[PDB]
A = this chain, B = another copy of it.
Amino acid sequence: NQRVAILLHEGTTGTIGKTGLALLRYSEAPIVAVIDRNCAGQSLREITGIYRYVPIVKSVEAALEYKPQVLVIGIAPKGGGIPDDYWIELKTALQAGMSLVNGLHTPLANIPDLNALLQPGQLIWDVRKEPANLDVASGAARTLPCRRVLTVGTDMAIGKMSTSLELHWAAKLRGWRSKFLATGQTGVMLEGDGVALDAVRVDFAAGAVEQMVMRYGKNYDILHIEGQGSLLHPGSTATLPLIRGSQPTQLVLVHRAGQTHNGNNPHVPIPPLPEVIRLYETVASGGGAFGTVPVVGIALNTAHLDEYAAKEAIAHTIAETGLPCTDVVRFGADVLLDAVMQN
């Protein structure tokens, strides 16, 4: 219910605002300002392609005019803790009587310089803080009656969350009791609950997923677990606990049409999709330790292509893999929901 200002300097049209743009694309909260000095006065729709109006202002001070109650950090430096230029914006929000939402790995709630400026009633939320009372997972989710669908990917930042959400909205539209489960800071900021898995200690990672899945599993027909990471990314781990903790019934593989190498580490290739499907299936079944878990279809991210090319790419992916496929954001999720439902 609180009016939001999103700190988004250099991230509206740049590369560091993934969180902020995701919030602008999906949050039902009343977002009253986008803070980006590079885009002040510009049209959010024209420069991002998101169908929403929010004034873009030069700074937190310029945002005050819109009376925001919470400043949400929507940018993150390429592996760089807290940049020196952030503090001024953070402190300005605090002195104005605002609360702070922080999705970064570095916690801000116990920094004296910020606590001193935090006015009564206001709070600083470190979204990545590990949930309490985690234990080791035991595969208990396999016992649940609901379907458990995990989005997996050929790389990170390709639409895994978008796919889980679109699949959730399609199941809801068709009359199923559906629930979306957040597994990253953005997802948790959107839903207001879940777990930022990449900040959980290795020992408790699977348990963090299991715990959330056991909390809602008996109350829904289908759970849509937000994917994270990739087994093709050399620095990623989070896919394993997602699979182990959730004991998925079906997998949906997300992939950006035409991508042949990891984005962060361009030397690492993306194998052909049939090989990627085999990899995930083998991991999900544990070579026989767990039940067979199929990749039921492919969610192809074609946003960079014209409609004609997008359709060809979809057609090519089906021919290559022999599985159902579409761009769920672009053309709808029913093709993949059906694939999930008739498994």
Contact = CB atoms under 8 A, between A and B. Distances in A.
Contact of A282 (B198, B205, B262, B282): B282
Interface in A47-67: none
Contact of A232 (B236, B237, B262, B289): B289
Interface string A223-244: 0000000011011111111001
Given A231-B286, A234-B244, A283-B231, A265 B198 contact: no
Contacts of A303: none
Interface string A248-290: 0000000000000010110111111001101100110011111
A279 B287 contact: yes
Nearest to A269: B289
A97 interface: no
A37 interface: no
A146 to B, nearest CB: 18
A137 interface: yes
Contacts of A234: 137-139, 206, 244, 247, 289-290
Nearest to A276: B287
Interface in A90-110: 105
Taking each of A198, A203, A236, A267, which has the highest tally of chain B beta carbons within 10 Å of its own beta carbon? A203
Contacts of A197: 202
A22 interface: no
A278 B287 contact: yes
A238 B204 CA distance: 10
Interface of A: 78-79, 105, 135-139, 197-203, 205-207, 210, 231-232, 234-241, 244-245, 247, 262, 264-265, 267-272, 275-276, 278-279, 282-283, 286-290
12 contacts: A136-B235, A137-B234, A137-B235, A201-B201, A202-B205, A231-B283, A235-B244, A237-B241, A268-B289, A269-B288, A275-B287, A282-B283
